[PDB]
């Protein structure tokens, strides 16, 4: 068993004592995690669906149910500078100890991790795809609406997803779009739909997406599975990185320049229930 005491272990496979702290506070930063839900697993999983019902022995039913499997897997590995960059005083970080080492990483590697995840989940821009969810659902089932801002358009967004039994749970609109939510007022029932203090679009919670892609985005789902299994893990090295750039048109010479890199092998999970709406703009 590992103790606090010292620090001279290159393969830093995190124990459950320190695995939870860093994974607890990364979720508040993440947008997709708040929309979705957490669970446990074995390692790779398969989920089942549908509603097999029947009475005692009155009469045998005409229709019959279908039982189908749906799997989820794939990981995501990173190499962050962060604390390997503080190799010139790793002996001072030894004085802080193995325990305090990851506490200083807690708002550093986590901040880099969540920004990538939201670009993969909601958008499909970054190169780490696997559970093609929200971007692909709009392409398959066309739930796109013309760009206007009235209470009728808000009910129209909900009405399309309500057609197939799915309840409207929560909105996703960025901070730039928040300005356009000010002007919405009905003619008969004169009142504010979007409150300024209380962050709620139509009595449902709003989440600001920071990735600069959607200009006037209004996405509604509230049905996902995000999951981080196993160990984040750590590896330190002093080798020449291929996928790296030093200053302008150079490569990271790690032997000469007294640097270090911290490899982090995290796990990702996504599930798709394909009934999602979106709205943007009229012409421009």
């Amino acid at each position: 068993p590992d103790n606090v005491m010292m620090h001279e272990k290159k393969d830093g496979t995190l124990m459950n004592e320190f695995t939870t702290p860093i994974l607890q506070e990364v979720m508040e930063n993440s947008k997709i995690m708040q929309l979705g839900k957490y669970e446990p697993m074995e390692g790779t999983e398969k989920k089942f669906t549908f509603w097999a019902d029947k009475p005692g022995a009155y009469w045998v039913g005409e229709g019959q149910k279908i039982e189908t499997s749906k799997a989820t897997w794939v990981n995501a590995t990173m190499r962050a500078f962060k604390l390997g960059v503080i190799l010139p005083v790793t002996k001072e970080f030894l004085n802080y100890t193995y325990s305090q080492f990851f506490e200083e990483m807690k708002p550093m590697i986590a901040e880099a991790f969540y920004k990538k995840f939201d670009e993969a989940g909601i958008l499909n821009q970054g190169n780490n795809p696997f559970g093609k969810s929200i971007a692909q659902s709009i392409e398959k089932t066309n739930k796109v609406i013309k760009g206007d801002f009235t209470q009728d358009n808000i009910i129209d967004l909900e009405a399309l997803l309500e057609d197939d039994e799915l309840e409207a749970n929560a909105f996703i609109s960025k901070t730039q779009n928040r300005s356009l939510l000010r002007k919405i007022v009905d003619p008969e029932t004169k009142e504010r739909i979007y409150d300024r203090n209380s962050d709620s679009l139509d009595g449902l919670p709003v989440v600001n997406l920071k990735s600069s892609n959607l200009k006037r985005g209004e996405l509604i789902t509230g049905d996902f599975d995000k999951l981080i299994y196993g160990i984040p893990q750590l590896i330190e090295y002093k080798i020449d990185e291929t996928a790296q750039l030093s200053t302008v048109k150079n490569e990271d010479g790690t032997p000469v320049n007294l640097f270090e890199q911290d490899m982090v092998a995290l796990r990702a999970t996504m599930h798709v229930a394909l009934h999602i709406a979106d709205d943007k703009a009229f012409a421009k």
Binding site: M27, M33, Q34, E39, I228
Partner: peptide
Amino acid sequence: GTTLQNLAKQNRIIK
């Protein structure tokens, strides 16, 4: 991460 399960649902707004 059994403590992670309960705290995750507590953090998020939807419930």
